[PDB]
Design a binder for these strands. Structure first.
Lengths: 479, 433, 137, 163, 29, 453
RNA sequence: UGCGAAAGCAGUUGAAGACAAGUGCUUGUCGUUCGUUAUAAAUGGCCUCG
């Protein structure tokens, strides 16, 4: 039990815990009433009023282990309905940050710490932040072209958050699983709900493509066969909740993750197509067919490569004629019509590609784990080359440079680098630098410094770029 | 499943508690009416507390706690309290008694009585012919073991249950005793089966019998319900010493009555509940006092080889009396020097039988334990019961592996008989994750 | 209790088809066998009563699946033709068939089993060495 | 609905699908078999498929016209897909077709598009194999271990008194 | 031959992943 | 607080035609030769059988008018465009015109010829002219006003003419198909009596239908071929049918996902749907007891329940018409009654698919060993009995393996003292061994398939 | 725990202090510390507004 509070008179006792249920204990009779089904486990509970008119509750959302997600609920005691729900942005980082510790539970689990586990876990977290070098702390975030609302892929759910008003507009559960069916308790807490890995919109914005990974339960024969799912969702502009239109189970085959997804440009199929790319170099082009009213696999290329690499990047030309597919260290130029290599199509690079992008039709910017290089497709030579090794060697897992590197379609792109500040062994506090680069990277338009780890940066459809900081702070860099 | 408190003067409801999930069968209370205990079908015992001063001032009861101690219906519950006693006793379809402390019901320890404590033995074994005989509810069944075969079973008319059954050493004569009547039946083996004939003797039929034993294959000793000990040859009354009246005897009559009758080689001993033990010479038919103990006697045995009588008190102390030092040298040295196991036992001894191979060694067993002691070797010197501040009136082998035990005795010098005991329940799920 | 002597009956089977008396076995007019023992067996016993007709096609199936007797049964096809070239089949509605054994087992009543047995025996023989005149018949 | 409450997941009328879904990218019964395939008569062909005799299967497909073989392969995939318990018998038909008309099947412009159902169907059975062997081994050990591992005597007092 | 070697190996691998009414007994004293 | 998520348990053209589920089979006294639909609401359809013509109510699906004045075999029941008239042919050669829904009055009676008149069709564009084809091999074009002489007498057929079609947007054009295998086109504006040109089908022509103003589909012999008059040649030909195709009907601009449908009788018991937009390709079909001689569907503007009609030589008429709380286990799981929910899964007469879901839910729920802790042989067999059959199915194959292992790891010692459970394992051993054996070929076959490609 | 693909390839799980229990000795523990990349189990399950 996490929160206990007496009523003003003392005739009632409020209790809350991991059950996700607030209990009113009626003490004259030890009866109990239940307000179950709350978003997060109850950290705190109080009676707030001269006459106990309202209840104030604190919710945690333990599903996100990376960060402690507090939500403050004020309930009308008369009818136990939400009088006021308050929360900030709820990003899910790849790893834990600063001094976030899981709440105490009866046993040590993935989402909780035992009594003994607290001190060891705290020491381990500090020493990981100090000695270890993998410090990705990067979060996927998405932006809506039609509404400019900010989508956070929470675990098994999506938060729609309006940064213009700095208020939450929606929270939608997009997967199956024990997500709000109950409050997980004891060994149930070891269960992992489906995780939304990649979320994107079509350019038109009326479609939502989502990629999910379902983890089988442990202690079972089929405990190692992860399930990969893809889902297509829709809604009208007036409507606020996405409705699921199609579901694909195990795309590209069985046990093959969908490592990259790219919505199609406007030129091809007026923005209702998409590309999905694996760690095996296989590409699938899906389109929405009016006749079926559903999403159908138009094209496929399944070269059964035997080497596995999570480092793949995909880019599509604006005209839509060609696709750039960087797999491991090699980039391929594949013609859309034949959906195969061009008839130099192959570009070998020093190391694995993390990001491949074209600022404009002429120039393609490719980032490898050791550097970044600007190439003219017109002449097929590198314009500029910048060494990222001193900053980016093994701090981040492959694929995060995609969400750290952002580009405008008019003015230019931006490179973001976060470094540890240390005076006399590394220290927990960090410092970030954002640099604006022109198309071909000839010149630096601007160089700005932020005092904290900028978890993510992306290009809003206006000229301004939006950046999310591990303080759950959304700033903007713009003219 | 609801318990309700009502104001007597105004005849109105004061408090209502929906505590049990099924019928509440019985209620009980402490002396000061501070605690109200409920029990019933759901196998749970609920304690209701008004102990706090504010509760007393406001006259409000509070259901403090509940406990699950019975596997089945709790049909009955009762309470007792004194300066030295605090017992909450409950029983029902589980056929066993459970004991708790009222003041510490929530936090105190509890004891679960054995289902069957054989203070009175309902099974006997005959060393000769290897017969095991059990009698229950006017039905006697006899088994032979070479492996066991139920050679015969006897069904009796009388509604009265059988008090005791005694089998002659040869086994040909079986005596079945009841308070109303005593009947003797001759057993004869034909084709691995026993033929039964009821020998007719009017005196036994009109004779009440608590205890009956065999002097030999022909002569028996019977103690009538009025405490009349006499010999029948198949009546020769035996003189008995008068017992002084005591206030305890007046309050509880049966304490002065005979509890154990044991005959061995024309020597008979009688133990009364008041601790009086007397040696009886059947041939002389005369009584001589032996001992006067302060505790209830649970088991008695006579060893001719050592010429002594072994008496066990309710406190599991062992006394060896010389038949005419009143007590043997072993008893003087070892009665207070018993091993840890004997003293720690919370169940009293009920059966004694001798060891054929060595007469000095004796066997002792209770409902859940069996022990053997050699009387030729001296030992190294090195809560839920009454505190007993008031008076009651006015070489070594120990095993607890075998339990529960109905009867224990030897078949031969190297063969031991151990007889052991081998309804739906209200579902109270045990959460498992 | 209902009983039929299959083994004894199977012994009768092996004797008849093993019997061989030259040209009368394959009559040139029709390709069938005029074997008087078989003809007597066909007319007096096989056609009249149902139960043997049922137990007949059952055992001839088993022998046909036995390689020891398969060659024998596949050769003397005229014997089979002489037997079955009649309308008095137990599955025929028009024919009224009696029973040999006083206590027939219930298996005889299974028409589907008989027809399945009947179909099997023909098909194996139709895969056999058919004569030109047998082919017309 | 309370605005604090999170919207629940509902699949509704959505269409489920799999990534392998490549649709938009004497005694013989041969003449019946050719007959039903041409005319798409489910009733007629099902009778042909009812034969369990291997020699019949070979002989029938041996004489089947090679072009009609291809459509037969497609149709067996569909009938397998609807009813997987008929997998065993129908692989035999697919097998004998493949060996006899293999030469014809080589001289075909495209196979995967026209035989996608078989490939998807056949792939599913393979994905089962690694798990079933694990089940068999566990199922092996347990059986392996476990394969190795009154009135006559009654005496009634009442009847005795009676006689 | 390689089939049965492999199939044999599979079984080994998955393998490695994985009161009487009357009783006669002799007591010890 | 939030409401509880409820436990979650072909081609579009095919799905449309599947909706004609309601099937009614009627018996007529002779072979049903011709079937017609009234162009006007309620679009009641007429059947030609024996010596009578019967009109069936679309909604009631029952005869409403019976036309028995016809003496010999009746050969047609075609309506005019308005539907207020219907014309019919007789073996005597007399062609009779009746007022629809008024059997009694013979409005116009014409003796076309001494030979039988098999085809009588009102001209679609022009009401007053009625065309009659006879075994005389002259297809006279009669007029309602002129009952004593044909307006025109088309000739040039050397065999029986049993097909007459009027081309939409070309009222002057008349198409005739004879058993010569020649389809002859005529212009009524000209003097006529001689075909504009002849199209060769090479097989006797059983019915000719104008699918569209420029495209005409002719079904003759074992195949049907679509001809374009502008090119004067067959664009497309499909011969999937095995018997000779007899009757052919076409509908357009109806609410199906497909814009237009073409239904063709086979005479082999099959009527199949072809889509003109995709080169007249096979999209659907149905099977009947015997040869199909007539097929028809409700016109485009049915305004009500759609009807598909098939005519069989036996006289049979088949009508296919397209008409225009929470469970126990869900309670147990919501109430956390793990063991009881599993019990609900194995109950008599329970759908296999639903049985999988509850098992899937418990596994997804992380409640597997718990559901099996309090069980013995008596209550374990129902799960095993399902496992014995579920193992065959591909979808359940993974799930059964999971459940079987846990009970096996959980009830080892129990299996020893229970002989009944052992036999369940033994037969379970055999079936999985078969399931292994079935899978083993599948890897052989799939590799074999790879060789060719 | 590191790396990597999801498969896997390598490497770990030490020492001190304090407390309790049993008999200075033994065992178990830690809302104690230093260092290394480093079973569970107090009968205890989710409201009402048709």
């Amino acid at each position: 039990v996490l929160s206990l509070s007496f009523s003003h008179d003392g005739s009632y006792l409020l209790s809350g815990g991991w059950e996700k249920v607030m209990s009113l204990w009626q003490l004259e009779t030890n009866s109990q009433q239940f307000l179950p089904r709350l978003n997060g486990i109850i950290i705190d509970c109080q009676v707030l009023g001269p006459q106990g008119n309202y209840y104030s509750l604190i919710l945690q959302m333990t599903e996100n282990n990376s960060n402690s997600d507090y939500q403050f609920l004020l309930l009308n005691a008369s009818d136990l309905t939400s009088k006021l729900s308050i929360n900030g942005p709820l990003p899910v980082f790849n790893s834990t940050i600063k001094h976030i510790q899981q709440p105490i539970s009866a046993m040590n689990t993935k989402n909780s710490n035992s009594i003994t586990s607290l001190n060891h876990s705290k020491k381990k977290q500090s020493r990981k932040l100090i000695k270890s070098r993998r410090q990705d702390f990067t979060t996927n975030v998405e932006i809506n072209p039609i509404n400019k609302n900010l989508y956070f892929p929470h675990i098994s759910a999506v938060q729609i958050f309006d940064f213009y008003k700095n208020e939450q507009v929606n929270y939608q559960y997009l997967t199956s699983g024990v997500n709000n069916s109950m409050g997980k308790v004891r060994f149930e807490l070891n269960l992992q709900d489906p995780i939304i890995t990649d979320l994107k919109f079509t350019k038109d914005g009326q479609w939502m493509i989502t990629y999910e990974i379902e983890y089988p339960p442990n202690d079972l024969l089929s405990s190692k066969d992860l399930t990969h799912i893809l889902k297509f969702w829709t809604k009208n502009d007036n409507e606020t909740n996405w409705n699921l239109k199609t579901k694909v189970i195990n795309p590209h085959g069985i046990s093959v993750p969908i490592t990259k997804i790219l919505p199609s440009p406007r030129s091809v199929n007026n923005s209702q197509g998409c590309l999905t790319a694996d760690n095996n170099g296989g590409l699938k082009f899906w389109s929405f067919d009016s006749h079926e009213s559903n999403w159908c696999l138009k094209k496929i290329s399944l070269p059964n490569f035997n080497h596995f690499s999570n480092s793949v990047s995909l880019a599509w030309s604006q005209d839509g004629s060609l696709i750039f597919h960087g797999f491991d260290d090699k980039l391929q130029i594949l013609d859309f019509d034949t959906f195969k290599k061009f008839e130099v199509s192959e570009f070998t690079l020093d190391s694995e590609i993390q990001t491949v992008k074209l600022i404009n039709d002429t120039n393609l910017i490719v980032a490898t784990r050791t550097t970044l290089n600007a190439i003219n497709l017109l002449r097929g030579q590198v314009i500029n080359s910048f060494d990222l090794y001193p900053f980016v060697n093994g701090v981040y897992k492959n694929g995060h440079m995609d969400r750290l590197i952002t580009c405008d379609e008019r003015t230019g792109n931006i490179a973001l680098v976060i470094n540890q500040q240390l005076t006399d062994v590394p220290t927990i506090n960090y410092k970030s630098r954002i640099i604006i680069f022109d198309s071909d990277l000839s010149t630096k338009l601007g160089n700005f410094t932020h005092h904290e780890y900028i978890s993510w940066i992306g290009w809003n459809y206006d000229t301004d770029f939006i950046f999310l900081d591990i303080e759950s702070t959304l700033g903007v860099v713009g003219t | 499943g609801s318990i309700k408190f009502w104001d007597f003067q105004f005849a109105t409801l004061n408090q209502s508690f929906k505590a049990h999930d099924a019928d509440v069968l019985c209620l009980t209370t402490d002396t000061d009416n501070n605690y109200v205990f409920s029990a019933g079908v759901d196998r749970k015992i609920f304690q209701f507390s008004q102990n706090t001063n504010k509760s007393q001032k406001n006259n409000r009861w509070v259901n403090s706690s509940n406990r699950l101690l019975h596997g089945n219906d709790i049909r009955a519950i009762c309470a007792y309290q004194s300066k030295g006693a605090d017992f909450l006793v409950s029983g029902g379809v589980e056929k066993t008694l459970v004991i708790n402390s009222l003041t510490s019901f929530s936090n105190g320890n509890y004891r679960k009585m054995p289902t069957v404590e054989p203070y009175s033995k309902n099974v006997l074994v005959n060393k000769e012919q290897r017969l095991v005989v059990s009698w229950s509810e006017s039905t006697v069944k006899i088994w032979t073991m070479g492996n066991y075969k139920l050679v015969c079973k006897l069904t009796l008319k009388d509604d009265q249950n059988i008090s005791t059954c005694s089998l002659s050493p040869d086994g040909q004569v079986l005596v079945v005793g009841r308070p109303s009547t005593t009947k003797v039946f001759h057993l004869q083996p034909v084709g691995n089966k026993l033929k039964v004939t009821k020998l007719d003797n009017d005196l036994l039929l009109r004779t009440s019998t608590k205890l009956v034993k065999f002097i030999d294959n022909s002569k028996i000793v019977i103690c009538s319900c009025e405490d009349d000990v006499f010999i029948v040859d198949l009546p020769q009354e035996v003189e008995l010493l008068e017992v002084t009246s005591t206030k305890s005897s007046i309050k509880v009559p049966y304490i002065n009555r005979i509890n154990h009758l044991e005959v061995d080689q024309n020597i008979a001993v009688i133990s009364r509940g008041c601790g009086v033990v007397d040696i009886l010479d059947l041939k002389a038919r005369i009584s001589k006092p032996l001992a006067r103990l302060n505790n209830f006697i649970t088991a008695v045995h006579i060893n001719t080889s050592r010429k002594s009588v072994v008496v066990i008190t309710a406190d599991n102390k062992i006394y060896e009396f010389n038949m005419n030092s009143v007590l043997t040298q072993w008893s003087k040295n070892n009665t207070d020097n018993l091993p840890k196991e004997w003293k720690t036992l919370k169940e009293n001894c009920v059966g004694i039988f001798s060891d054929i191979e060595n007469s000095s060694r004796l066997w002792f067993w209770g409902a859940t334990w069996i022990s053997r002691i050699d009387f030729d070797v001296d030992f190294p010197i090195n809560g839920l019961t009454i505190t007993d501040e008031s008076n009651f009136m006015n070489h070594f082998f120990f095993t607890d592996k075998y339990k529960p035990l109905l009867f224990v005795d030897l078949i031969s010098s190297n063969e031991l008989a151990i007889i052991e005991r081998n309804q739906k329940a209200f579902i109270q799920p045990k959460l498992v994750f | 209790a209902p009983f039929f002597p299959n083994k004894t009956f199977r012994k009768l089977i092996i004797a008849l088809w093993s019997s061989n008396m030259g040209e009368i076995e394959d009559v040139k007019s029709s390709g069938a066998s005029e074997n008087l023992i078989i003809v007597e067996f066909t007319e007096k016993y096989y056609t009249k009563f149902a139960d043997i007709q049922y137990y007949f096609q059952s055992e001839f199936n088993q022998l046909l699946e036995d390689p020891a007797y398969q060659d024998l049964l596949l050769k003397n096809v005229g014997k089979w033709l002489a037997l079955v070239n009649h309308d008095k089949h137990c599955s025929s509605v028009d024919a009224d068939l009696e029973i040999f054994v006083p206590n027939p087992p219930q298996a005889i009543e299974n028409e589907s089993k008989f027809k399945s047995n009947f179909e099997k025996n023909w098909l194996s023989l139709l895969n056999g060495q058919l004569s030109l005149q047998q082919y017309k018949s | 609905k309370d605005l604090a409450s999170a919207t629940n997941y509902v699949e509704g009328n959505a269409r489920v699908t799999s990534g392998d879904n490549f649709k938009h990218v004497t005694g013989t019964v041969t003449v019946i078999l050719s007959q039903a395939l041409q005319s798409n008569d489910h009733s007629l062909l099902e009778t042909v498929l009812n034969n369990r005799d291997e020699r019949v299967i070979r002989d029938t497909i041996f004489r089947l016209k090679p072009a009609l073989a291809v459509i037969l392969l497609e149709r067996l995939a569909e009938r397998i897909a609807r009813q997987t318990h008929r997998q065993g018998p129908l692989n035999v038909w697919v097998k004998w077709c493949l060996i006899i008309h293999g030469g014809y099947l080589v001289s075909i412009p495209n196979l995967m598009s026209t035989l996608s159902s078989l490939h998807s169907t056949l792939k599913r059975r393979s994905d089962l194999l690694p798990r079933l062997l694990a089940l068999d081994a566990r199922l092996d050990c347990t059986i392996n271990k476990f394969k190795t591992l009154e009135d006559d005597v009654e005496y009634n007092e009442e009847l005795d008194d009676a006689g | 031959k390689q089939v049965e070697i492999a199939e044999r190996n599979t079984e080994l691998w998955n393998l490695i992943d994985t009161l009487p009414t009357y009783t006669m007994e002799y007591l010890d004293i | 607080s939030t409401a509880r998520p409820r436990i979650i348990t072909t081609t579009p053209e095919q799905r449309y035609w599947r909706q004609y589920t309601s099937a009614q089979l009627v018996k007529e006294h002779n072979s049903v030769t011709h079937i017609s639909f009234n162009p006007q609401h309620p679009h009641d359809f007429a059947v030609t059988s024996s010596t009578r013509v019967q009109i069936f109510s679309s909604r009631t699906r029952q005869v409403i008018k019976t036309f028995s004045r016809f003496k010999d075999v009746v050969y047609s029941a075609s309506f005019r465009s308005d539907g207020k008239l219907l014309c019919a042919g007789d073996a005597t050669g007399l062609v009779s015109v009746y007022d629809s829904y008024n059997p009694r009055t013979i409005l116009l009676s014409i003796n076309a010829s001494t030979h039988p008149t098999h085809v009588t069709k009102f001209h679609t564009q022009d009401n007053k002219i009625l065309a009659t084809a006879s075994d005389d091999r002259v297809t006279r074009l009669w007029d309602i006003s002129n009952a004593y002489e044909p307006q025109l007498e088309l000739t040039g057929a050397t065999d029986y003419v049993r097909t007459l079609s009027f081309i939409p947007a070309a009222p002057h054009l008349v198409a005739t198909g004879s058993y010569d295998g020649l389809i002859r086109l005529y212009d009524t504006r000209s003097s006529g009596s001689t075909p504009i040109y002849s199209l060769n089908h090479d097989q006797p022509v059983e019915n000719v239908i104008a699918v569209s103003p420029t495209q005409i589909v002719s079904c003759g012999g074992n195949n049907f071929k679509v001809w374009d008059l502008t090119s004067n040649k067959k664009l497309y030909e499909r011969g999937n049918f095995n018997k000779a195709v007899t009757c052919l009907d076409y509908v357009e601009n109806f609410d199906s996902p497909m814009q237009s449908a073409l239904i063709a009788s086979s005479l082999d018991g099959h009527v199949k749907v072809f889509d003109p937009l995709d080169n007249f390709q096979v999209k659907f079909g149905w099977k009947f007891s015997g040869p199909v001689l007539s097929c028809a569907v409700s016109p485009s503007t049915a305004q009500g329940n759609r009807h598909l009609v098939a005519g069989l030589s036996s006289g049979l008429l088949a009508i296919r018409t397209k008409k225009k709380r929470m469970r126990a286990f869900e309670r147990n799981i919501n109430q956390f009654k793990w063991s009881e929910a599993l019990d609900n899964a194995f109950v008599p007469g329970m759908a296999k698919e639903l049985t999988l879901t509850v098992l899937q839910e418990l596994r997804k729920r992380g409640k597997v060993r718990v559901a099996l802790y309090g069980r013995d042989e008596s209550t374990l067999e129902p799960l095993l009995n399902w496992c014995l059959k579920g193992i065959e199915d591909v979808r359940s194959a993974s799930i059964v393996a999971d459940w079987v292992a846990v009970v096996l790891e959980l009830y080892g010692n129990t299996l020893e003292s229970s002989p009944v459970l052992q036999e369940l394992m033994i037969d379970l051993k055999t079936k999985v061994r078969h399931e292994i054996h079935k899978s083993k070929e599948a890897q052989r076959i799939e590799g074999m398939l790879q060789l060719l490609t």
